[PDB]
Amino acid sequence: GMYTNTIIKTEIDEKVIKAFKLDALTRSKLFFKLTTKLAVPFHLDQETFEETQLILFGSIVEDGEALATPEAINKWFEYNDVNPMDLFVWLVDENLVTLFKG
C-alpha cells in the first residue's frame, strides 16, 4: 500500500529496468522533506536520504510485484549490477521532479 500500478521503465547500462510509480501523497511527502531538509540548506539529515532510496529502490519490480525489503533490494543490485545513483537519480526525476513541472 505505497506504490501505484502504472509502470515507468528505463535503460541503465545494459539492462532494461522498470519500477512502480509512487502514490501522489507518498510523492508529495518525500518531495516536501527533500526540498526542506536537503535542498534549501543550499547540517543535513541522514535518515532522510536513507529513507527515500529505501522507498525508490523499493518500487522496482520482479515477479509482477515489488522489491520491498532491503534483503531483496541489495540482492537485486548484486545480480543486475546496475549503478545505484543513476537508478536513484532517475527514480527521483520521475517520481519527484515531475511535481515541480506542472
CB atoms within 10 A of CB 95: 24
Yes or no: say if 45 and 35 are a contact pair by the CB < 8 Å rule: no
Q: Where are the beta strands (DSSP E) in the chain?
A: 3-12, 15-22
| Distance in angstroms (rounded) separating the CA atoms of residues 99 and 17 | 22
For 47, what's the count of Cα atoms within 13 Å in the CB-facing half-sphere? 0
SS3 55: helix
Structure resolution, Å: 3.3
| Distance in angstroms (rounded) separating the CA atoms of residues 59 and 68 | 7
SS3 4: strand
> How distant, in Å, are the alpha carbons of 32, 41, 43 from that of 3?
18, 29, 31
SS3 3: strand
**C-alpha radius of gyration, the chain, whole number:** 14
| Distance in angstroms (rounded) separating the CA atoms of residues 80 and 95 | 22
